[PDB]
Write a protein that binds this ligand. Structure first.
Ligand SMILES: CN(C)CCNC(=O)c1cc2c(cnn2CC2CCCCC2)cc1Cc1ccc(F)cc1F
Ligand SMILES: Fc1ccc(-c2n[nH]cc2-c2ccncc2)cc1
Length: 335
């Protein structure tokens, strides 16, 4: 066991190993509290997240276990991974706090898309890396569910990482309709919304609520056709759609004028209303828009990921002991 030092940062208190120095608050909210730090063992600038009340309730305890299992499994250049996980407690009885460590990135995509306007080549490379990370995530039967600029970080090399899994302007419309069985291409919808925003500098669907959001989407891609209507079980959904002033699929080349025709074509394949017809991450990496970057032998998939715990009804102490197990079995990655 290493040796710890303590401090108060904002109103959070922090107990971390000596190796992590110069902790500076980066922001805080539901997830927990995040500090930037300098790792003296490796020389890396790292990001340290202290979970908020990880074992306060069954939902918190399960969510804590979920996040740690996920982060420990992701080993991919475009997906955040675990550099380290530690607790100050020396026993399971005292175990009450969890800190997670990952590489610190330079800026989030929210601060690139406002502070400058992005060239087509940057858009190619950035979307390529998202899709490459998404191919790996999806190959593990994992859905991100919350892809958006603020959950994407880039360094000065323009290298990109997807972070923090799970009216929202980037959410697939089958969720605005509350369909219970949405699939992994909800993430592709979000990528479509993001790439559109990098090309125009404007939010694509800046809706004010679930209803306004769906209306902005249908104005671009048009009302659902009969093949898609046949798949909607919800009678209220079905009725609301059949009794809207019907609208045609706009031509995307008109909407996204001046954009590379290949970027427009890919956008048409991502922002399809019917989720069964949406392009997948693996197929999108092979789209000609990414010819400059696509390499089928350097777009790996993930080892299988056991998500059986998701269906379990356990006590707080059981979720907590399972989390402790995962802290101790952690093997840092080869430096
Ligand atoms: C909307 N999100 C923000 C929710 C909260 N996520 C983070 O604050 C976060 C951001 C991260 C990183 C890494 N690089 N950057 C990009 C930032 C860095 C500060 C300013 C420039 C851009 C990590 C984490 C969170 C985090 C995850 C896992 C982990 F093991 C430790 C963690 F710390
Ligand atoms: F208006 C819309 C918008 C999206 C959809 C949709 N796309 N993919 C799947 C669905 C869907 C929606 C509701 N119920 C089942 C399936 C259906 C109607």
């Amino acid at each position: 066991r290493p040796t710890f030092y303590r401090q108060e940062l904002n109103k959070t208190i922090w107990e971390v190993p000596e190796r992590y120095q110069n902790l500076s608050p980066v922001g805080s909210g539901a997830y927990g509290s995040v500090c930037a730090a300098f790792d003296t063992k490796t020389g890396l600038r790292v990001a340290v997240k202290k979970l908020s009340r990880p074992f306060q309730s069954i939902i918190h305890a399960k969510r804590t276990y979920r996040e740690l299992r996920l982060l420990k499994h992701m080993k991919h250049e475009n997906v955040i991974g675990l550099l380290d996980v530690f607790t100050p407690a020396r026993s399971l009885e005292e175990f009450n706090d969890v800190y997670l460590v990952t590489h610190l990135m330079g800026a989030d995509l929210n601060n690139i898309v406002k502070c400058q306007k992005l060239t087509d080549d940057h858009v190619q490379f950035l979307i390529y890396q998202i899709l490459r990370g998404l191919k790996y995530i999806h190959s593990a039967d994992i859905i991100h569910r919350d892809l958006k600029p603020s959950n994407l970080a880039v360094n000065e090399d323009c290298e990109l990482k997807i972070l923090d899994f799970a009216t929202r302007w980037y959410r697939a419309p089958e969720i605005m309709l509350n369909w219970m069985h949405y699939n992994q291409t909800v993430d592709i919808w979000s990528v479509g919304c993001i790439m559109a925003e990098l090309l125009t500098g404007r939010t694509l669907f800046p809706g004010t609520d679930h209803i306004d959001q769906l209306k902005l989407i249908l104005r671009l891609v048009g009302t659902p056709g009969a093949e898609l209507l046949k798949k909607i079980s919800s009678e209220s959904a079905r009725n609301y759609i059949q009794s809207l002033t019907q609208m045609p699929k706009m031509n995307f080349a008109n909407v996204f004028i001046g954009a590379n025709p290949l970027a427009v074509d890919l956008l048409e394949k991502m922002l399809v209303l019917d989720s069964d017809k949406r392009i997948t991450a693996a197929q999108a990496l092979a789209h000609a828009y990414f010819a400059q970057y696509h390499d089928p032998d350097d777009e790996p998939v993930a080892d299988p990921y056991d998500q059986s715990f998701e269906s379990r009804d356990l006590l707080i102490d059981e979720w907590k002991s399972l989390t402790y197990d995962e802290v101790i079995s952690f093997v840092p990655p080869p430096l």
